[PDB]
Amino acid sequence: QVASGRAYIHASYNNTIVTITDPDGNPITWSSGGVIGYKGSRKGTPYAAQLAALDAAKKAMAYGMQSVDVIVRGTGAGREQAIRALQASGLQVKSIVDDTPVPHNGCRPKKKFR
């Protein structure tokens, strides 16, 4: 069991996946917009993310998780609602950092982002 750890939010236009890990970054448990029961574009909404965050706290708290630094990646719509849900869950949420990957103009992107 681990009392302190990391909560990751991968927030995309299609979905919000949330995984909670240990202080060493190795996953304890994870939820997602599909896990709580949605298919298709529903998996992208904030309610979708809100359920995945809460099922992720609900999950990790059952292992003794208490404190979590929050890490956020991606400009999804259900993003800001995922962080609220983590705080209003009962987890010490000691930080929020945003490690969103931006390339310094690297690989040419697919036609739909050009």
Binding site: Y38, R42, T45, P46, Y47, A48
Partner: protein, 155 residues
């Protein structure tokens, strides 16, 4: 409509109970402009929920109204290329109106023959908790709870 909110008609209180909501139900019973008939069908039922239930028609009546008032409803909206079922909160004017409408409707499905009997027995089941009248409310609500995912698409 297209220029301002039309004003809600106030309705005169009745003369058997002096209530403004007992009247607004009387109307919903009334067919082809025969209000005298709308009265004696309703009132006969008030006798009924007294004969078979030692309590107050106006008490049974109003409680059944608060038992069919749909707190949440869905109201469609075409977002992008799909007509989603967005969950709107309901106006207490509309809650009133749907409850009164669904009562007679859920009543005028019942099996017993005379109308006044169906109006009492449906108010005698909605005031308690059961009845097809309440089912409409409970169904409509679960239709909105199931679609709270789109509750942000509200206006």
């Amino acid at each position: 409509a297209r220029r301002r909110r039309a004003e809600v008609r106030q309705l005169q209180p009745d003369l058997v109970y002096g209530d403004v909501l007992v009247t607004a139900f009387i109307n919903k019973i009334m067919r082809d402009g025969k209000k005298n008939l709308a009265a004696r069908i309703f009132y006969d039922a008030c006798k009924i929920i007294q004969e078979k239930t030692g309590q107050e028609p106006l008490k049974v009546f109003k409680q059944a109204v608060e038992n069919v008032k749909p707190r949440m409803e869905v109201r469609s909206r075409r977002v992008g290329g799909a007509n989603y079922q967005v969950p709107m909160e309901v106006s207490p004017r509309r809650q009133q109106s749907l409850a009164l409408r669904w009562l007679v409707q859920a009543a005028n499905q019942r099996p017993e023959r005379r109308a006044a009997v169906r109006i009492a027995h449906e108010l005698m089941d909605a005031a308690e908790g059961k009845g097809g009248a309440v089912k409409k409310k409970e169904d409509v609500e679960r239709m909105a709870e199931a679609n709270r995912a789109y509750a942000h698409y509200r206006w």
